Write a protein that binds this DNA or RNA. Sequence first.
DNA 1: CTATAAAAAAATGTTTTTT
DNA 2: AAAAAACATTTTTTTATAG
Lengths: 180, 72
Amino acid sequence: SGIVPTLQNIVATVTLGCRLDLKTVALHARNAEYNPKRFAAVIMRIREPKTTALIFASGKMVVTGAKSEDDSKLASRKYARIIQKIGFAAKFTDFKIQNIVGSCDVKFPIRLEGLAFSHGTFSSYEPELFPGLIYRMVKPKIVLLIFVSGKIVLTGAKQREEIYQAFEAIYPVLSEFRKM
Amino acid sequence: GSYCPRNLHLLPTTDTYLSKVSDDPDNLEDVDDEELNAHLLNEEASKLKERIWIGLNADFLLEQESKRLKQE
DNA sequence: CTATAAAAAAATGTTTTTT
DNA sequence: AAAAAACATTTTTTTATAG
Protein backbone atom coordinates (compact mmCIF):
# COMPACT_ATOMS: atom_id res chain seq x y z
CA SER A 1 0.00 0.00 0.00
CA GLY A 2 2.52 2.59 1.20
CA ILE A 3 5.76 0.66 0.61
CA VAL A 4 7.70 -0.16 -2.59
CA PRO A 5 10.33 -2.93 -2.96
CA THR A 6 14.03 -1.93 -2.86
CA LEU A 7 16.22 -3.46 -5.57
CA GLN A 8 19.09 -5.00 -3.63
CA ASN A 9 20.31 -7.16 -6.51
CA ILE A 10 20.11 -7.51 -10.29
CA VAL A 11 21.59 -10.13 -12.56
CA ALA A 12 22.87 -9.10 -16.00
CA THR A 13 23.78 -11.43 -18.86
CA VAL A 14 25.79 -10.12 -21.84
CA THR A 15 27.47 -11.47 -24.97
CA LEU A 16 30.80 -10.15 -26.34
CA GLY A 17 30.72 -12.44 -29.39
CA CYS A 18 34.21 -14.00 -29.47
CA ARG A 19 35.74 -17.16 -27.95
CA LEU A 20 38.46 -15.38 -25.94
CA ASP A 21 41.21 -17.13 -23.95
CA LEU A 22 40.79 -16.82 -20.18
CA LYS A 23 44.46 -17.34 -19.31
CA THR A 24 45.27 -13.87 -20.68
CA VAL A 25 42.17 -12.03 -19.33
CA ALA A 26 43.01 -12.71 -15.69
CA LEU A 27 46.76 -12.00 -16.03
CA HIS A 28 45.67 -8.50 -17.09
CA ALA A 29 43.51 -6.95 -14.33
CA ARG A 30 43.50 -6.00 -10.65
CA ASN A 31 40.64 -8.36 -9.86
CA ALA A 32 41.92 -11.55 -11.47
CA GLU A 33 40.71 -14.86 -10.01
CA TYR A 34 41.13 -17.62 -12.57
CA ASN A 35 40.93 -21.05 -10.95
CA PRO A 36 40.10 -23.42 -13.84
CA LYS A 37 40.11 -26.38 -11.44
CA ARG A 38 37.43 -24.44 -9.52
CA PHE A 39 35.13 -22.30 -11.65
CA ALA A 40 35.65 -22.29 -15.43
CA ALA A 41 35.64 -18.43 -15.42
CA VAL A 42 37.49 -15.23 -14.41
CA ILE A 43 36.32 -13.04 -11.52
CA MET A 44 36.58 -9.24 -11.75
CA ARG A 45 34.84 -7.49 -8.83
CA ILE A 46 34.85 -3.80 -9.97
CA ARG A 47 34.24 -0.83 -7.58
CA GLU A 48 31.90 1.56 -9.51
CA PRO A 49 29.17 0.89 -10.26
CA LYS A 50 29.80 -2.05 -7.87
CA THR A 51 29.45 -5.62 -9.27
CA THR A 52 31.32 -8.96 -9.53
CA ALA A 53 30.49 -10.56 -12.92
CA LEU A 54 32.00 -13.78 -14.29
CA ILE A 55 33.68 -13.84 -17.73
CA PHE A 56 33.43 -16.94 -19.96
CA ALA A 57 35.96 -18.06 -22.59
CA SER A 58 33.09 -18.03 -25.12
CA GLY A 59 32.53 -14.34 -24.41
CA LYS A 60 29.30 -14.17 -22.38
CA MET A 61 29.93 -13.12 -18.76
CA VAL A 62 27.49 -13.26 -15.85
CA VAL A 63 27.36 -9.76 -14.40
CA THR A 64 25.78 -10.00 -10.90
CA GLY A 65 25.77 -7.09 -8.45
CA ALA A 66 23.81 -4.05 -9.61
CA LYS A 67 21.68 -2.03 -7.21
CA SER A 68 19.66 -0.67 -10.16
CA GLU A 69 19.57 -0.65 -13.99
CA ASP A 70 21.91 2.33 -14.43
CA ASP A 71 24.54 0.24 -12.64
CA SER A 72 23.84 -3.21 -14.18
CA LYS A 73 24.17 -1.92 -17.74
CA LEU A 74 27.37 0.01 -16.90
CA ALA A 75 28.76 -2.78 -14.70
CA SER A 76 28.80 -4.96 -17.80
CA ARG A 77 29.97 -2.01 -19.94
CA LYS A 78 33.13 -1.72 -17.87
CA TYR A 79 34.39 -5.25 -18.64
CA ALA A 80 33.85 -4.24 -22.24
CA ARG A 81 36.48 -1.53 -21.85
CA ILE A 82 38.99 -3.83 -20.11
CA ILE A 83 38.74 -6.89 -22.41
CA GLN A 84 38.85 -4.34 -25.24
CA LYS A 85 41.86 -2.42 -23.88
CA ILE A 86 43.75 -5.68 -23.33
CA GLY A 87 44.04 -7.53 -26.67
CA PHE A 88 40.62 -8.81 -27.78
CA ALA A 89 37.92 -7.61 -30.21
CA ALA A 90 34.66 -8.39 -28.31
CA LYS A 91 31.61 -6.08 -28.59
CA PHE A 92 28.79 -5.29 -26.12
CA THR A 93 25.82 -7.26 -27.43
CA ASP A 94 22.40 -8.22 -25.99
CA PHE A 95 22.31 -6.80 -22.47
CA LYS A 96 19.66 -9.08 -20.98
CA ILE A 97 18.71 -8.83 -17.30
CA GLN A 98 17.89 -12.33 -16.07
CA ASN A 99 16.93 -11.53 -12.48
CA ILE A 100 16.01 -8.69 -10.20
CA VAL A 101 15.70 -9.10 -6.42
CA GLY A 102 13.56 -7.13 -3.98
CA SER A 103 12.98 -6.43 -0.29
CA CYS A 104 11.43 -4.15 2.34
CA ASP A 105 9.82 -4.17 5.80
CA VAL A 106 6.03 -4.09 6.15
CA LYS A 107 6.70 -3.01 9.77
CA PHE A 108 4.54 -5.60 11.62
CA PRO A 109 4.80 -9.31 12.66
CA ILE A 110 3.31 -11.73 10.09
CA ARG A 111 1.81 -15.15 10.87
CA LEU A 112 2.93 -17.92 8.51
CA GLU A 113 1.43 -21.12 9.96
CA GLY A 114 -1.99 -19.87 8.81
CA LEU A 115 -1.01 -18.37 5.45
CA ALA A 116 -0.14 -21.99 4.58
CA PHE A 117 -3.85 -22.82 5.01
CA SER A 118 -5.69 -20.31 2.81
CA HIS A 119 -3.09 -19.45 0.18
CA GLY A 120 -1.36 -22.83 0.67
CA THR A 121 -2.15 -23.78 -2.92
CA PHE A 122 0.63 -21.29 -3.79
CA SER A 123 2.72 -21.92 -0.66
CA SER A 124 5.27 -24.23 1.01
CA TYR A 125 6.27 -23.58 4.63
CA GLU A 126 8.44 -25.86 6.77
CA PRO A 127 9.26 -23.98 10.01
CA GLU A 128 12.53 -25.52 11.26
CA LEU A 129 13.81 -26.11 7.71
CA PHE A 130 13.72 -22.43 6.71
CA PRO A 131 11.98 -19.77 8.85
CA GLY A 132 10.60 -18.13 5.71
CA LEU A 133 7.36 -18.83 3.89
CA ILE A 134 7.77 -19.36 0.12
CA TYR A 135 5.08 -17.77 -2.08
CA ARG A 136 4.93 -19.06 -5.65
CA MET A 137 3.08 -16.34 -7.59
CA VAL A 138 1.85 -16.88 -11.15
CA LYS A 139 0.81 -13.47 -12.48
CA PRO A 140 3.41 -12.32 -12.66
CA LYS A 141 5.80 -15.21 -11.91
CA ILE A 142 7.82 -13.64 -9.06
CA VAL A 143 8.79 -15.62 -5.94
CA LEU A 144 8.22 -13.94 -2.60
CA LEU A 145 9.90 -14.90 0.68
CA ILE A 146 7.74 -13.88 3.67
CA PHE A 147 9.61 -13.86 6.99
CA VAL A 148 8.15 -13.89 10.55
CA SER A 149 9.26 -10.33 11.38
CA GLY A 150 7.53 -8.92 8.29
CA LYS A 151 10.41 -8.67 5.84
CA ILE A 152 9.87 -9.90 2.25
CA VAL A 153 12.36 -11.01 -0.43
CA LEU A 154 10.81 -10.50 -3.90
CA THR A 155 13.36 -12.16 -6.19
CA GLY A 156 12.07 -13.34 -9.57
CA ALA A 157 11.18 -10.75 -12.23
CA LYS A 158 13.07 -9.22 -15.20
CA GLN A 159 11.20 -5.90 -15.20
CA ARG A 160 11.17 -3.60 -12.15
CA GLU A 161 7.44 -2.84 -12.57
CA GLU A 162 6.81 -6.58 -12.35
CA ILE A 163 8.35 -6.90 -8.87
CA TYR A 164 6.37 -3.88 -7.57
CA GLN A 165 3.06 -5.49 -8.59
CA ALA A 166 4.05 -8.58 -6.58
CA PHE A 167 4.24 -6.47 -3.41
CA GLU A 168 0.95 -4.65 -4.09
CA ALA A 169 -0.86 -7.89 -4.90
CA ILE A 170 0.31 -9.78 -1.78
CA TYR A 171 -0.32 -6.81 0.54
CA PRO A 172 -4.02 -7.22 1.55
CA VAL A 173 -2.88 -10.79 2.38
CA LEU A 174 0.11 -9.63 4.48
CA SER A 175 -2.46 -7.42 6.26
CA GLU A 176 -4.99 -10.19 6.98
CA PHE A 177 -2.43 -12.60 8.46
CA ARG A 178 -0.81 -10.88 11.46
CA LYS A 179 0.05 -10.89 15.19
CA MET A 180 -2.07 -8.12 16.76
CA GLY B 1 -1.86 4.78 -1.24
CA SER B 2 -3.88 3.52 1.74
CA TYR B 3 -7.33 3.90 0.09
CA CYS B 4 -7.83 3.46 -3.69
CA PRO B 5 -4.94 1.32 -4.95
CA ARG B 6 -1.56 2.12 -6.50
CA ASN B 7 -1.38 3.63 -9.99
CA LEU B 8 0.60 1.31 -12.30
CA HIS B 9 2.85 3.78 -14.13
CA LEU B 10 3.51 6.37 -11.46
CA LEU B 11 6.37 4.16 -10.26
CA PRO B 12 9.71 3.95 -12.12
CA THR B 13 10.29 1.33 -14.82
CA THR B 14 13.47 -0.70 -15.38
CA ASP B 15 13.12 0.46 -19.00
CA THR B 16 13.69 4.08 -17.90
CA TYR B 17 16.71 2.89 -15.91
CA LEU B 18 18.17 1.13 -18.94
CA SER B 19 17.52 3.94 -21.44
CA LYS B 20 19.56 6.11 -19.04
CA VAL B 21 22.76 4.19 -20.00
CA SER B 22 24.48 4.18 -23.42
CA ASP B 23 23.76 1.42 -25.96
CA ASP B 24 26.76 1.80 -28.31
CA PRO B 25 28.06 -1.79 -28.72
CA ASP B 26 31.29 -0.81 -30.56
CA ASN B 27 32.17 2.56 -28.96
CA LEU B 28 32.12 1.63 -25.26
CA GLU B 29 34.49 4.61 -24.96
CA ASP B 30 32.13 6.66 -22.76
CA VAL B 31 32.68 4.90 -19.42
CA ASP B 32 36.45 5.56 -19.21
CA ASP B 33 37.37 7.45 -16.00
CA GLU B 34 40.94 6.58 -14.87
CA GLU B 35 39.99 4.02 -12.18
CA LEU B 36 38.58 1.83 -14.94
CA ASN B 37 41.68 2.66 -16.97
CA ALA B 38 43.64 1.24 -13.99
CA HIS B 39 42.27 -2.35 -13.99
CA LEU B 40 44.94 -3.27 -16.56
CA LEU B 41 48.33 -4.00 -14.99
CA ASN B 42 51.61 -3.34 -16.84
CA GLU B 43 54.58 -5.59 -17.74
CA GLU B 44 56.50 -5.85 -14.46
CA ALA B 45 53.15 -6.18 -12.66
CA SER B 46 51.55 -8.65 -15.11
CA LYS B 47 54.74 -10.74 -15.13
CA LEU B 48 54.44 -11.21 -11.38
CA LYS B 49 50.90 -12.63 -11.74
CA GLU B 50 51.76 -15.14 -14.49
CA ARG B 51 54.63 -16.17 -12.20
CA ILE B 52 52.33 -16.63 -9.16
CA TRP B 53 49.32 -18.02 -11.08
CA ILE B 54 51.59 -20.72 -12.58
CA GLY B 55 52.58 -21.89 -9.08
CA LEU B 56 49.07 -21.97 -7.61
CA ASN B 57 47.79 -23.79 -10.70
CA ALA B 58 50.81 -26.07 -11.35
CA ASP B 59 48.29 -28.52 -9.93
CA PHE B 60 45.85 -27.80 -12.79
CA LEU B 61 48.60 -27.43 -15.42
CA LEU B 62 49.86 -31.03 -15.19
CA GLU B 63 46.49 -32.75 -15.86
CA GLN B 64 46.05 -30.39 -18.82
CA GLU B 65 49.55 -31.27 -20.03
CA SER B 66 48.57 -34.94 -19.69
CA LYS B 67 45.37 -34.13 -21.61
CA ARG B 68 47.84 -33.12 -24.34
CA LEU B 69 49.22 -36.70 -24.11
CA LYS B 70 45.82 -38.43 -24.45
CA GLN B 71 45.32 -36.17 -27.49
CA GLU B 72 48.60 -37.17 -29.20
C1' DC C 1 24.77 -24.39 5.81
C1' DT C 2 19.35 -24.30 5.32
C1' DA C 3 16.15 -21.64 1.03
C1' DT C 4 14.77 -18.19 -3.93
C1' DA C 5 16.08 -17.41 -8.69
C1' DA C 6 18.96 -16.40 -12.58
C1' DA C 7 22.30 -16.80 -16.24
C1' DA C 8 26.73 -19.80 -18.10
C1' DA C 9 30.05 -23.66 -19.95
C1' DA C 10 33.88 -26.37 -18.31
C1' DA C 11 32.87 -31.22 -16.15
C1' DT C 12 31.45 -35.31 -14.30
C1' DG C 13 27.24 -37.85 -13.57
C1' DT C 14 22.53 -40.77 -15.40
C1' DT C 15 19.62 -42.82 -18.55
C1' DT C 16 19.43 -44.71 -22.68
C1' DT C 17 20.25 -45.80 -27.19
C1' DT C 18 23.70 -48.33 -30.62
C1' DT C 19 26.68 -51.28 -31.24
C1' DA D 1 27.47 -57.14 -20.63
C1' DA D 2 29.90 -52.64 -23.57
C1' DA D 3 31.19 -48.59 -25.89
C1' DA D 4 28.26 -44.40 -27.19
C1' DA D 5 26.35 -40.67 -28.26
C1' DA D 6 22.30 -38.84 -25.16
C1' DC D 7 20.41 -35.89 -21.41
C1' DA D 8 20.86 -34.09 -16.55
C1' DT D 9 23.33 -32.11 -12.74
C1' DT D 10 26.92 -30.16 -9.66
C1' DT D 11 29.58 -25.78 -9.67
C1' DT D 12 29.88 -20.51 -9.17
C1' DT D 13 28.46 -15.46 -8.50
C1' DT D 14 25.40 -11.78 -6.13
C1' DT D 15 21.82 -10.17 -2.12
C1' DA D 16 18.88 -9.76 1.58
C1' DT D 17 16.60 -12.74 5.15
C1' DA D 18 16.23 -15.67 9.29
C1' DG D 19 16.46 -20.43 12.02
